[PDB]
Amino acid sequence: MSKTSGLYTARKLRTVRRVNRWADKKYRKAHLGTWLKANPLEGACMARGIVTQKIGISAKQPNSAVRKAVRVQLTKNSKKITAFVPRDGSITYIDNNDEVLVAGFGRAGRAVGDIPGCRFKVIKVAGIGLLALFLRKREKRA
Amino acid sequence: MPVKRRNNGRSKYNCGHTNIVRCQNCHRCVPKDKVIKRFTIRNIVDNTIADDVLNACVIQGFAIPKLYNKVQYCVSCSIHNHIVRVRSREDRKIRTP
Amino acid sequence: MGRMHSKGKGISRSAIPYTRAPAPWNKYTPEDVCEQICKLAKKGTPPSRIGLILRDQFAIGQVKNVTGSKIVRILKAKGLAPEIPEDLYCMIKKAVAIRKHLERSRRDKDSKFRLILVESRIHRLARYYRQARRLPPTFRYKSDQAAALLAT
Amino acid sequence: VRINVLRDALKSICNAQRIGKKQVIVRPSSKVIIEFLQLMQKNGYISDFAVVDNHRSNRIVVNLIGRLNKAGVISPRFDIPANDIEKWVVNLLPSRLFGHIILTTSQGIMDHIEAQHRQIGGKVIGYFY
Amino acid sequence: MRAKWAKKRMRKLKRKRRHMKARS
Amino acid sequence: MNVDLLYPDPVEEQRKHKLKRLVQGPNSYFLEIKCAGCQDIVVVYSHANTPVFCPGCTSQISIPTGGKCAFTSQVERYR
RNA sequence: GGCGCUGCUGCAGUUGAAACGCCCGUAGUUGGCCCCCCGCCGCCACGAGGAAACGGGAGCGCUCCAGGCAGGUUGGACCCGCCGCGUGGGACCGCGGCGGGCCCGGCGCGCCGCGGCAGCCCCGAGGAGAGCGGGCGGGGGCACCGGUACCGGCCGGGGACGGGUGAAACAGGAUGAUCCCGCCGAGACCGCCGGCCGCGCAGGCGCCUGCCAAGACCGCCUCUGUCAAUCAAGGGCGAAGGCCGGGGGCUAGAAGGCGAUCAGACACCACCGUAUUCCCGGCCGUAAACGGUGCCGCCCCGCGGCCGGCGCGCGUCCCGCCGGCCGCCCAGGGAAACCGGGAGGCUCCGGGCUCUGGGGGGAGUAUGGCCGCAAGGCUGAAACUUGAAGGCAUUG
Ligand SMILES: [K+]
Ligand SMILES: [K+]
Ligand SMILES: [K+]
Ligand SMILES: [K+]
Ligand SMILES: [K+]
Ligand SMILES: [K+]
Ligand SMILES: [K+]
Ligand SMILES: [K+]
Ligand SMILES: [K+]
Ligand SMILES: [K+]
Ligand SMILES: [K+]
Ligand SMILES: [K+]
Ligand SMILES: [K+]
Ligand SMILES: [K+]
Ligand SMILES: [K+]
Ligand SMILES: [K+]
Ligand SMILES: [K+]
Ligand SMILES: [K+]
Ligand SMILES: [K+]
Ligand SMILES: [K+]
Ligand SMILES: [K+]
Ligand SMILES: [K+]
Ligand SMILES: [K+]
Ligand SMILES: [K+]
Ligand SMILES: [K+]
Ligand SMILES: [K+]
Ligand SMILES: [K+]
Ligand SMILES: [K+]
Ligand SMILES: [K+]
Ligand SMILES: [K+]
Ligand SMILES: [K+]
Ligand SMILES: [K+]
Ligand SMILES: [K+]
Ligand SMILES: [K+]
Ligand SMILES: [K+]
Ligand SMILES: [K+]
Ligand SMILES: [K+]
Ligand SMILES: [K+]
Ligand SMILES: [K+]
Ligand SMILES: [K+]
Ligand SMILES: [K+]
Ligand SMILES: [K+]
Ligand SMILES: [K+]
Ligand SMILES: [K+]
Ligand SMILES: [K+]
Ligand SMILES: [K+]
Ligand SMILES: [K+]
Ligand SMILES: [K+]
Ligand SMILES: [K+]
Ligand SMILES: [K+]
Ligand SMILES: [K+]
Ligand SMILES: [K+]
Ligand SMILES: [K+]
Ligand SMILES: [K+]
Ligand SMILES: [K+]
Ligand SMILES: [K+]
Ligand SMILES: [K+]
Ligand SMILES: [K+]
Ligand SMILES: [K+]
Ligand SMILES: [K+]
Ligand SMILES: [K+]
Ligand SMILES: [K+]
Ligand SMILES: [K+]
Ligand SMILES: [K+]
Ligand SMILES: [K+]
Ligand SMILES: [K+]
Ligand SMILES: [K+]
Ligand SMILES: [K+]
Ligand SMILES: [K+]
Ligand SMILES: [K+]
Ligand SMILES: [K+]
Ligand SMILES: [K+]
Ligand SMILES: [K+]
Ligand SMILES: [K+]
Ligand SMILES: [K+]
Ligand SMILES: [K+]
Ligand SMILES: [K+]
Ligand SMILES: [K+]
Ligand SMILES: [K+]
Ligand SMILES: [K+]
Ligand SMILES: [K+]
Ligand SMILES: [K+]
Ligand SMILES: [K+]
Ligand SMILES: [K+]
Ligand SMILES: [K+]
Ligand SMILES: [K+]
Ligand SMILES: [K+]
Ligand SMILES: [K+]
Ligand SMILES: [K+]
Ligand SMILES: [K+]
Ligand SMILES: [K+]
Ligand SMILES: [K+]
Ligand SMILES: [K+]
Ligand SMILES: [K+]
Ligand SMILES: [K+]
Ligand SMILES: [K+]
Ligand SMILES: [K+]
Ligand SMILES: [K+]
Ligand SMILES: [K+]
Ligand SMILES: [K+]
Ligand SMILES: [K+]
Ligand SMILES: [K+]
Ligand SMILES: [K+]
Ligand SMILES: [K+]
Ligand SMILES: [K+]
Ligand SMILES: [K+]
Ligand SMILES: [K+]
Ligand SMILES: [K+]
Ligand SMILES: [K+]
Ligand SMILES: [K+]
Ligand SMILES: [K+]
Ligand SMILES: [K+]
Ligand SMILES: [K+]
Ligand SMILES: [K+]
Ligand SMILES: [K+]
Ligand SMILES: [K+]
Ligand SMILES: [K+]
Ligand SMILES: [K+]
Ligand SMILES: [K+]
Ligand SMILES: [K+]
Ligand SMILES: [K+]
Ligand SMILES: [K+]
Ligand SMILES: [K+]
Ligand SMILES: [Mg+2]
Ligand SMILES: [Mg+2]
Ligand SMILES: [Mg+2]
Ligand SMILES: [Mg+2]
Ligand SMILES: [Mg+2]
Ligand SMILES: [Mg+2]
Ligand SMILES: [Mg+2]
Ligand SMILES: [Mg+2]
Ligand SMILES: [Mg+2]
Ligand SMILES: [Mg+2]
Ligand SMILES: [Mg+2]
Ligand SMILES: [Mg+2]
Ligand SMILES: [Mg+2]
Ligand SMILES: [Mg+2]
Ligand SMILES: [Mg+2]
Ligand SMILES: [Mg+2]
Ligand SMILES: [Mg+2]
Ligand SMILES: [Mg+2]
Ligand SMILES: [Mg+2]
Ligand SMILES: [Mg+2]
Known part of the structure; x- marks a missing residue:
């Protein structure tokens, strides 16, 4: 019957499911424990760090552009990341020592769109929300 | 690549392995049940002189001897020398000689 | 049969009569076919061949129908199994x-x-x-x- | 080897009716098969049958009148409390109004309507509709 | 590459690694 | 035409395999033969493959053949 | 949750990812039919006993409401812990000498055969194993043995080229080749017949004669009495190439050498040739080891061919039965090609058992372990990367 039947086979039916559960990439990513170790944010929604550089990144094949990003050192584990800055003209609030709050792009650690090697993005600069800085609701000191 | 023929291109029924023959044109190795096989009976002298040998023969009641040859070729040599042709999908089912 | 240790699938077998009774021409009593069975067992004949001999010479289709027991059981009853x-x-x-x-x-x-x-x-x-x-x-x-x- | 004689009987009967036959032979017979055919008869899905003796496992000859949409067994025979019957009714049956799930209980073999009429449970053996 | 020759290449690679790790 | 499976015709039932009949039964039977030189008569299985002798003779009078057995110089019956 | 993309209900495994090369076999899982009205499990029902809050739920206008337990004789009813305990059922699923009197309230314990009992065997599977008869077949092992051919040598003859290719060149020849005929040696091989023939567990299997053990099928009024199915661990066999130690050595021929071709040719084509190819004793354990289709069991419109055994009929045939190998094909199935002796009887989904897969890469890699003389084999990740890869089919 391609599966075992019979009134006394509960142990086998449970062993098979336990073994074949690991064959799914989603389950293996969320349950094995290697992704939690390798995750730069250590399983958190966001993380703060200091900017070490400003950079421009080429887009992928069918598009043509220079995307604006920053290399960031993490406070809590001293890892190296790169984070994207959205919203036209926003790369002008980022001095080379500016505490930044950084979150993900969505897709839970996968690159999106046309930016090669980018999985994070800046949401706050030196204490102030970057979106409200673009919408002209608050301003930086000087 | 789906399956092209029900016989898989050979005549092998209820056995594991069959004998090897050498193609008579190029000498490659072919299994015996796949090789193209033809039998020929011909005269040793060509028909265009078959009456001049006969009229210049001293023995009374002589009969021209014959030759018996079984020719066996591989698939490539059979197609190249036109012993068999590439056929339409419908025509491939025909076994008539 | 021919199927535990091969890919046989043969069905050749014997099928015994529905009616379970002596033959119309059966003269024998149980006490006189037990005699022949025991004489044949003493002589060294295996139990499968005894049934063959009783079938082919004494015109007895099944020993059970004429006695009420089976051949090996009769041998066991007379200590000759x-x-x-x-x-x-x-x-x-x-x-x-x-x-x-x-x-x-x-x-x-x-x-x-x-x-x-x-x-x-x-x-x-x-x-x-x-x-x-x-x-x-x-x-x-x-x-x-x-x-x-x-x-x- | 042969394990579920009732399963083979019901497959044979469904095949024979799908062809459009009047009679069908099923072998071997058994007490359970006779109980199942008796219930099918009393609901009106089959006509007369006859068990013929052969000093072995017998045969059965079944007469067919074209009323059987489907018949099957449930293996293994899971046991069912009184309150889970309906969670099985909307699983196997084409509706809540016709069809029959057959249970064995300590009060005999019976369909599900009588099983909730006597408010008891048992073990499922098959279904027809 | 034809997979047979890729397998041949990989076997030669693994044998080179075993030989280099044999030292020390 | 309307056959009933519960009462099959015996003639077309004898031509089927002994096991797939309605009620399985044997194919063999017994029969009487007469010794070519003795007045008496003996009862012989139809599918014998073991020696069968005369009451007097010491020559075996049957030939096993893989099916129904043949006999040497004797004349037979059916009972 | 979507997601039947984790599938017990309920997935997929011919070709998209996926049936171990094959046979044996322990644990495990599963196991035909039959006696009913006893015992012991399981199972179903009803009880007893233990906590509230939460969750359900009877009644009530905090103005409604999330609430709360209120209130105008009252009320806060009831249900929900559990593989244990008690009562009942008993379909389904298993497992299993007696009386009387001594004797006396019972039970044991022995004592008398005392004359009371029908004293104490379902059946014989279109399960299986054993038997006897009969043919059947490139099934296996050992010894022996014929035939031409390829190669090599020798005698005689005769006298200019022979070989090789698409065309040529290197090899050969007045030391007489090539060619013709006779004689000799050695080692391989087993043609035509040779097949929609046949055999074996698969890998595989073809000269003569002799010996040896086996096998499936058929036939049967022979014997036994469930002795079975599938199988982690474990055992055995396993093309070719390859390895160790001996032997042999014709042919072909990895490597190597050499003549052409070509821009180049270290290749394809020509010529010479080592290991190897063959025998013996071991090792290795892999193939598109393919029907790309695991094993056992049931039902299943028909028309044909061939192989083995048996039976009836006429006068070799002819009609059946069982077992095997094939072709076509209604229904049904399917993404289709196609299958149809299943790939059917399946979203109308449940006969039993074992194995494998879960987008494409990285990768069958790194690492550890076991095995191997080695070459290997078996077991076998992660970081990271990517928007498709793939199947079958249509037109150009
Ligand atoms: K499956
Ligand atoms: K499945
Ligand atoms: K399974
Ligand atoms: K069970
Ligand atoms: K699974
Ligand atoms: K393809
Ligand atoms: K082929
Ligand atoms: K064959
Ligand atoms: K063959
Ligand atoms: K041909
Ligand atoms: K070819
Ligand atoms: K078997
Ligand atoms: K068979
Ligand atoms: K069979
Ligand atoms: K003995
Ligand atoms: K490959
Ligand atoms: K390969
Ligand atoms: K390879
Ligand atoms: K028949
Ligand atoms: K028969
Ligand atoms: K017969
Ligand atoms: K899901
Ligand atoms: K779900
Ligand atoms: K669901
Ligand atoms: K499936
Ligand atoms: K293919
Ligand atoms: K793959
Ligand atoms: K694969
Ligand atoms: K593949
Ligand atoms: K398999
Ligand atoms: K496996
Ligand atoms: K095995
Ligand atoms: K053994
Ligand atoms: K086995
Ligand atoms: K054993
Ligand atoms: K054993
Ligand atoms: K076994
Ligand atoms: K076992
Ligand atoms: K067990
Ligand atoms: K199991
Ligand atoms: K079990
Ligand atoms: K079983
Ligand atoms: K219970
Ligand atoms: K019950
Ligand atoms: K309490
Ligand atoms: K009161
Ligand atoms: K209990
Ligand atoms: K109780
Ligand atoms: K009770
Ligand atoms: K007392
Ligand atoms: K023979
Ligand atoms: K044969
Ligand atoms: K032979
Ligand atoms: K042979
Ligand atoms: K042989
Ligand atoms: K041999
Ligand atoms: K031999
Ligand atoms: K010779
Ligand atoms: K010779
Ligand atoms: K010349
Ligand atoms: K040779
Ligand atoms: K022959
Ligand atoms: K033949
Ligand atoms: K032949
Ligand atoms: K043969
Ligand atoms: K043959
Ligand atoms: K034959
Ligand atoms: K043959
Ligand atoms: K033959
Ligand atoms: K016989
Ligand atoms: K055993
Ligand atoms: K078994
Ligand atoms: K099984
Ligand atoms: K096995
Ligand atoms: K194994
Ligand atoms: K093993
Ligand atoms: K052995
Ligand atoms: K052995
Ligand atoms: K081997
Ligand atoms: K090998
Ligand atoms: K070698
Ligand atoms: K040699
Ligand atoms: K040699
Ligand atoms: K080689
Ligand atoms: K070369
Ligand atoms: K090259
Ligand atoms: K090339
Ligand atoms: K050469
Ligand atoms: K070598
Ligand atoms: K050699
Ligand atoms: K070879
Ligand atoms: K050799
Ligand atoms: K080998
Ligand atoms: K493969
Ligand atoms: K193949
Ligand atoms: K399997
Ligand atoms: K024939
Ligand atoms: K025949
Ligand atoms: K045969
Ligand atoms: K025949
Ligand atoms: K025949
Ligand atoms: K025949
Ligand atoms: K048949
Ligand atoms: K058959
Ligand atoms: K047949
Ligand atoms: K077949
Ligand atoms: K298996
Ligand atoms: K597998
Ligand atoms: K596999
Ligand atoms: K696999
Ligand atoms: K390693
Ligand atoms: K070693
Ligand atoms: K070594
Ligand atoms: K070595
Ligand atoms: K090594
Ligand atoms: K090694
Ligand atoms: K290794
Ligand atoms: K594709
Ligand atoms: K593919
Ligand atoms: K492809
Ligand atoms: K493919
Ligand atoms: K299509
Ligand atoms: K398509
Ligand atoms: Mg077996
Ligand atoms: Mg069978
Ligand atoms: Mg028979
Ligand atoms: Mg028969
Ligand atoms: Mg789900
Ligand atoms: Mg033989
Ligand atoms: Mg071994
Ligand atoms: Mg070995
Ligand atoms: Mg040579
Ligand atoms: Mg050479
Ligand atoms: Mg493999
Ligand atoms: Mg394979
Ligand atoms: Mg395979
Ligand atoms: Mg055939
Ligand atoms: Mg065939
Ligand atoms: Mg076929
Ligand atoms: Mg799996
Ligand atoms: Mg290693
Ligand atoms: Mg290792
Ligand atoms: Mg299409």
């Missing part, structure tokens, strides 16, 4: 024959294959007889010792 049942004995005989053939021919792998099959069947049947109390609990088939037990 064998120590080892006939089928296990025949399998041991065939194993001894194949081993003795293999002693001269060490390059015969087909015979080694069939020897394995026979001995597996022997062990399974020996276990059946042992747990059924038709054989001593210490019964064991031993390949090396099997030639001289056939004498006893």
